């Protein structure tokens, strides 16, 4: 689902900054820029990415 970065962090159970570090590592966003209610991610895409990195 479409979520902002803080909501992504909450969903994953990580700090927000960890998501931004994940962006450095290839985590896709759906629409960009940065922290808070700016960068929008899709939960399903983040989970697929997450699962394909340490699974």
Q: Which is nearer to a second copy, 10 or 38 (CB)?
A: 10
Q: Does 4 engage in binding with a second copy (CB under 8 A)?
A: no
The answer to whether the beta carbons of residues 7 and 16 sit under 8 Å apart is no
Q: Does 26 engage in binding with a second copy (CB under 8 A)?
A: no
Three-state helix/strand/coil letters over 4-34? EHHHHHHHHCCCHHHHHHHHHCCCCCCECCC
Residue labelled with tokens 């700090």: 15
Selected from 13, 25, 26, 31, the binder of a second copy by CB under 8 A is 13
Interacting residue ranges for a second copy, rule: CB under 8 A: 1, 7, 10-13, 42-45, 47-48, 50-55
């Amino acid at each position: 689902m479409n979520v902002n970065k803080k909501k992504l962090a909450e969903i994953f159970g990580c700090d927000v900054r960890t998501v931004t570090a994940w962006q450095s590592q290839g985590l896709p966003l759906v629409s960009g820029g940065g922290k808070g209610n700016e960068a929008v991610f899709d939960t399903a895409a983040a989970i697929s990415w997450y699962a394909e990195r340490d699974a």
